[PDB]
């Protein structure tokens, strides 16, 4: 009884953030100078989970090295985390089968795809789940979603869906994703003869935080065609492809919940984190013995940081420790990892900087992601959408156009490390 299990499907979203997912996987990269997996762990801790299993497929050692060293390996940790390795490019469905083929699920559990940020205390929703289940063992899953706006900055296309719920008992009777081209919403009327008040809602978020029952794994080994948790599973229950089961939505109306899946979300969530929408899970809390401190206009610093005179910091700015900022430089709406260092007479806006990054004097940065250990010379410039990887260096008097991703390896994108690295090229 005293067992709340929970699995987390890392790696399953490694492809969208590809240009950086080489030196570090996606479940290890920093969001506001803090890796994602912790943002997800402390979430599960809120739920009272006591046994966690983490699927891994990329940098498993690099993944497990953190976990085994993480604060979650100590005896004070609320749960016992064990990692699980499998083939690369892991499809959600295939995980649950391997889970079923292992016999690990004692009772009801939760599962997330990727890494989530949230403060929703699940201790009440599963109480709802455990309730309506103990009278109907055919209620196998309940879905946690966040009420929001149809054009909310935190609701992207993968999160953009349409639900139809029984306003009394909260049961998703119909679901469909939002693909531009799908102009209509088609529901078999045979449900109205079983439901009085139905609420068609396009305002949800679909945090993709589903709470599943021990049937689900065995329900996934059987019905092996199911790969996606929403495109295949839900559609099966609703089309009665599965032997008459029920699912439910627990639409949250306070607190916060979302997950990191897209570059157009990492930017969004970060602003939604700096803006304290997910208290206590905030830099100012310093859960990993950091030295952060909130300052007005939502600017965050760390101890033993050096800010020059005539260097000005605007709102929505975060500064890691051990980081230099030269004279007459202007930072704004920017997240900066620790051990960084900025040149002089520069201008940075809406950017993202990680650990051990340097910047030449008099450079212009904006709306770009700069990975760990990156060197930028003086006079350089770099515009929106730009994405770099680790080790990459850009020579002085250089520019990088929009969305021009790059790397330091021999793979698909157009990256090479030596200086300069665009019109003047290394590796080619």
């Amino acid at each position: 009884k005293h067992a709340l299990q929970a699995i987390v499907l890392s790696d399953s979203y490694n492809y969208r953030f590809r240009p950086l997912t080489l030196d570090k996987p996606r479940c290890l990269l920093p969001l506001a100078n803090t890796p994602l997996i912790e943002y997800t762990f402390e979430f599960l801790a809120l739920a009272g989970v006591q046994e966690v299993y983490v699927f891994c497929c990329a940098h498993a050692g690099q993944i497990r090295e953190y976990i085994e060293k993480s604060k979650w390996n100590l005896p004070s940790s609320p749960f016992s985390v064990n990692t699980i390795v499998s083939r690369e490019s892991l499809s959600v469905g295939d995980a649950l089968r391997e889970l079923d083929s292992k016999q690990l699920i004692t009772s009801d559990f939760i599962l997330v795809s990727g890494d989530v940020v949230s403060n929703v205390p699940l201790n009440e929703v599963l109480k709802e789940h455990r309730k309506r289940r103990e009278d109907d063992k055919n209620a196998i899953m309940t879905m946690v979603v966040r009420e929001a706006s149809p054009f909310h900055r935190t609701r992207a296309r993968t999160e953009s869906s349409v639900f139809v719920i029984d306003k009394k008992t909260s049961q998703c009777v119909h679901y469909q994703a939002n693909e531009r081209g799908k102009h209509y919403v088609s529901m078999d009327p045979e449900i109205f003869n079983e439901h009085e008040e139905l609420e068609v809602r396009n305002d949800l978020i679909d945090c993709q935080i589903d709470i599943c029952s021990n049937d689900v794994p065995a329900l996934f080994t059987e019905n092996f065609d199911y790969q996606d948790i929403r495109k295949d599973f839900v559609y099966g229950v609703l089309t009665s492809d599965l032997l008459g089961k029920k699912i439910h939505c627990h639409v949250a109306k306070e607190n916060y919940a979302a997950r990191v899946r897209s570059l157009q979300t990492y930017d969004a969530i970060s602003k939604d984190v700096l803006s304290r929408w997910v208290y206590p899970f905030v830099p100012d809390s310093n859960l990993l013995n950091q030295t952060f401190s909130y300052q007005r206009h939502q600017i965050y610093k760390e101890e033993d940081v050096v800010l020059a005179r005539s260097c000005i910091i605007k709102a929505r700015t975060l500064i890691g420790a051990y980081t230099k900022v030269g004279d007459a430089s202007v930072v704004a709406n920017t997240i900066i990892g620790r051990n960084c260092t900025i040149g002089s007479n520069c201008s940075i806006d809406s950017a993202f900087l990680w650990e051990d990054v340097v910047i030449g004097d008099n450079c212009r940065i904006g709306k770009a992601i700069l990975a760990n250990s990156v060197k930028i010379g003086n006079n350089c410039s770099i515009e929106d959408g730009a994405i770099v990887a680790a080790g990459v260096v850009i020579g002085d008097n250089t520019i990088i156009e929009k969305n021009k991703r790059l790397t330091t390896f021999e793979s698909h994108s157009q990256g090479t490390l030596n200086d300069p690295s665009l019109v003047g090229i290394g590796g080619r």
Partner: protein, 409 residues
């Protein structure tokens, strides 16, 4: 004009008893005159109007009924309103609610209310006008929980079909209204809708009550648009499609064209609204099977009977019997309704049944849950269970259940 103009004017409809066959066949009594609680079904829409503040409304009946109706209005109308009757010669039966006032458009001068002869309603009238006055929409439509029948669902193959209502709780605006006539194979929903008002509640146990309140300008649309046959059928969805369908940009010029809702510079319109309202008690409209209920539902009544002779060895209680009727020995009336000056024979049993006016029932019969039109007559020792009897029709010692008995032709 007692210093003050008129806010609205009320329109009442009295079409053929389309779905009330055994009761509405004859021309001796039309749909707008079947008794309900020993009062013609027309008494109720007007009484609601009379208490609403109206002092005069107009009524549009079929030509075959213009004679009997006002006769009741002259002698038989308990109210005090002044009813303008109207009988357009266009009413070719194929017409409906919209086509009617199209012919009599020139009578409207302000915003108007469209009730119906069956609009039985106890909903307080201020609740419908204010919400129109407050929200200043283009139309307001009243909906009610579908009527629940106390007795077992005997047979209900033609009960006001079934409706699907889409309403946004916040604005109380109406966004989906489709009955199971323009059906859907794989039933649809416009996604282009859900991108504004992304929350649409869907009700399925709701039924119409034919209480609509339109702004004045809608008539200008009704005159132009010939493709509008029934208000409930065609008008409302037309008004709901224009609410959200972008490309449905056919000239809304009827809005601005000096409609006079200011009335010079535009502080109004620029958009077409459409709301809905729901209650909880006493509000529906007869389409046959309701007549048994809305009459039964019409005994929050009181007590006594008048100008009626129930001899000894006879009992009757909590029933309603109108003037002049007579009941002869060893018979019994139970949970039943009996119209004007009917004749009840000896040793008969009429229970759970509705009896209109001017009917005579011979001795020793049984009437279990039946409806008998006016002028009728049933023969001795007959027995009817769940049967309807046509107007001025008679039956001799017959016996059947689940039968519509009518003078053959």
């Amino acid at each position: 004009l007692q210093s003050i103009p008129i806010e609205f004017q009320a329109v009442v409809f009295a079409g053929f008893g389309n779905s009330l066959y055994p009761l509405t066949g004859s021309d001796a009594l039309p749909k707008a005159l079947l008794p309900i609680g020993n009062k013609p079904m027309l008494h109720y829409p007007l009484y609601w109007l009379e208490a609403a503040g109206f002092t005069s409304a107009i009524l549009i009946c079929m030509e075959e009924a213009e004679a009997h109706i006002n006769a009741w209005l002259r002698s038989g109308y308990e109210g005090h309103m002044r009813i303008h009757v109207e009988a357009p010669t266009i009413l070719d039966d194929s017409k409906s609610s919209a086509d009617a006032l199209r012919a009599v458009s020139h009578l409207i001068k302000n915003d108007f209310v469209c009730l119906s002869c069956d609009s039985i309603v106890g909903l307080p009238p201020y609740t419908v006008l204010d919400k129109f006055r407050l929200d200043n929409p283009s139309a307001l439509a009243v909906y009610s929980p579908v009527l629940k029948y106390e007795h077992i669902t005997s047979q209900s193959k033609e009960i006001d079909a079934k409706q699907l209502i889409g309403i946004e709780e916040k604005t109380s605006r109406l966004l989906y209204a489709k009955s199971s006539a323009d059906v859907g194979s794989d039933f649809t929903f416009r996604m282009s809708l859900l991108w504004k008002h992304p929350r649409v509640t869907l009700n399925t146990n709701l039924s119409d009550a034919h209480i609509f309140v339109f702004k004045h300008w809608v008539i200008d649309l009704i005159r132009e648009k010939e493709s509008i046959s029934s208000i409930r059928g065609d008008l409302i969805p037309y008004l709901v499609k224009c609410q959200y369908q972008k490309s449905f940009t056919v000239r809304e010029n009827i809005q601005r064209f000096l409609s006079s809702p200011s009335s010079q510079e535009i502080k109004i319109n620029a958009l077409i609204a459409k709301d809905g309202i729901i209650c909880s008690r006493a509000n529906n409209l007869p389409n046959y099977f309701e007549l048994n209920k809305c009459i039964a539902k019409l005994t929050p009544e009181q007590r006594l009977v008048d100008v009626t002779v129930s001899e000894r060895a006879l009992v009757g209680a909590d029933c309603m019997v109108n003037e002049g009727t007579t009941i002869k020995d060893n018979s019994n009336i139970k949970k039943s309704i009996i119209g004007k000056n009917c004749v009840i024979g000896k040793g008969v049993v009429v229970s759970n049944s509705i009896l209109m006016d001017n009917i005579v029932v011979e001795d020793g019969v049984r009437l279990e849950s039946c409806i008998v039109a006016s002028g009728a007559q049933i023969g001795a020792k007959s027995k009817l269970r769940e049967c309807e009897i046509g107007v001025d029709h008679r039956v001799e010692a017959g016996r059947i259940a689940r039968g519509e008995r009518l003078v053959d032709m």
